[PDB]
Amino acid sequence: SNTRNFVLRDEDGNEHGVFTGKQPRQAALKAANRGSGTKANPDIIRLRERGTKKVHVFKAWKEIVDAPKNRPAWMPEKISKPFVKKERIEKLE
């Protein structure tokens, strides 16, 4: 199985995210849809975690963006959905 945990705080601060995502990019667009971006109170920042290799730089809101190299065979971010503005990401392999 493959699951990566990440930590961040929304409400216009960073981005709310404190849990594990099976896919870093594919779950990136899916995650904001529900909890990675409140939209009424979300933000853009490097969602990282120290100690281990965990760093995702993106922005998570609720609006129609473009699938930022999420490679999600289920659904990309090219659609009316949670906005996800990409930025360099680095995580534990």
UniProtKB/Swiss-Prot annotation:
Q: Which UniProt keywords apply?
A: DNA-binding
Which residues lie within the region annotated Disordered? 1-44
User: One MF term from GO for this chain?
Assistant: DNA binding
- Which Gene3D superfamilies is this protein grouped with? Chromosomal protein MC1
Biological processes annotated in GO: DNA protection
| Function description | Protects DNA against thermal denaturation and modulates transcription.
Q: What is this protein called?
A: Chromosomal protein MC1
- Which organism does this sequence originate in? Methanosarcina thermophila
Provide the organism lineage as a comma list.
Archaea, Methanobacteriati, Methanobacteriota, Stenosarchaea group, Methanomicrobia
